[PDB]
Amino acid sequence: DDPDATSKKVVPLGVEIYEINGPFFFGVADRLKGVLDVIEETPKVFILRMRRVPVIDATGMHALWEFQESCEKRGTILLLSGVSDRLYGALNRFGFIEALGEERVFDHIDKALAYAKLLVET
Ligand SMILES: [Cl-]
Structure with missing residues (x-):
């Protein structure tokens, strides 16, 4: 059904993953707020x-x-993964791409994970 489900991937220890359910409007915003203040063991990579x-x-x-x-x-x-060309355009016009750094933005979970793995290793 979904070859790219997180459950199908090898997620390194120290990497946390949060999947957004749709348009990132006030609903998602309310749920993402403060997520790092309620994880007890702070992830190296999110x-x-x-x-x-x-x-x-x-x-x-x-x-x-x-x-x-x-x-x-x-x-x-x-890291951001699964960023479509339309989302990237929004995030670039808002200034977020240059603030985060392009090398942190991926179009696919496999690439973000490959990078996360490298980051935890090093
Ligand atoms: Cl994704």
Whole structure:
């Protein structure tokens, strides 16, 4: 049914993964808020899976900025995976791509995981 389900992948220890359920509007924003303050063992790498996300509004983008700030305060590396060309365009116009760094943004979970693995190894 879904060859790219997280359950089908090899997820290194120290990598946490959070999958968004759709458009990143106020619902998703309310759920992502503060997620790093309730994980007890802070992840080295956090992957936000965005394959289901074609669109983000201002509230979504505000939550995503504050989440990236929370990751930097915890020395967690944020990666985005499954970023479509339309989402990337939104995130670039908002300024988020240049703030996070292009090398942290992937179009597929396999690539993000490959990088996460390298980061945990090193
Ligand atoms: Cl993804």
